Nucleic acid binder design. Structure first.
Ligand SMILES: [Mg+2]
Length: 48
RNA sequence: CCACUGUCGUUGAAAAGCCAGGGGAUGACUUGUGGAUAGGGGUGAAAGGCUAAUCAAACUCGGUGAUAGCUGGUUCUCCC
């Protein structure tokens, strides 16, 4: 009933997603939270 | 036709040659043209040799984005 220009989802409704490997300042650069080179840091790795 | 020795050359004149020497040179000889044998198959006076500069299993395409506990890389910012 407002404008299309001024509706908001409200606080807590939306969270921005994490993007791994986008620099130092993001807290997820380089390894992207995977730590260092073991089986878990590799691509198709799982928790069997 | 071959390839024993050496020098040279080794981003070569050349992805195997040159030069100087060397061996066979009527023979199990060399060579032209066409054909046959096809990949775990061929062919081999046998070196795992050769099968188009590719051979302890050719090449191309496809399964296929094979798999890779391995290596590398992984991109804006500030606060706790
Ligand atoms: Mg060859």
């Amino acid at each position: 009933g407002l404008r299309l220009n001024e509706l908001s989802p409200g606080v807590g409704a939306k969270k921005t997603a994490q993007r791994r490997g986008r620099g130092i300042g993001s807290g997820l650069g380089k390894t992207g939270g995977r730590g260092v080179k073991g089986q878990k840091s590799r691509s198709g790795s799982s928790i069997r």
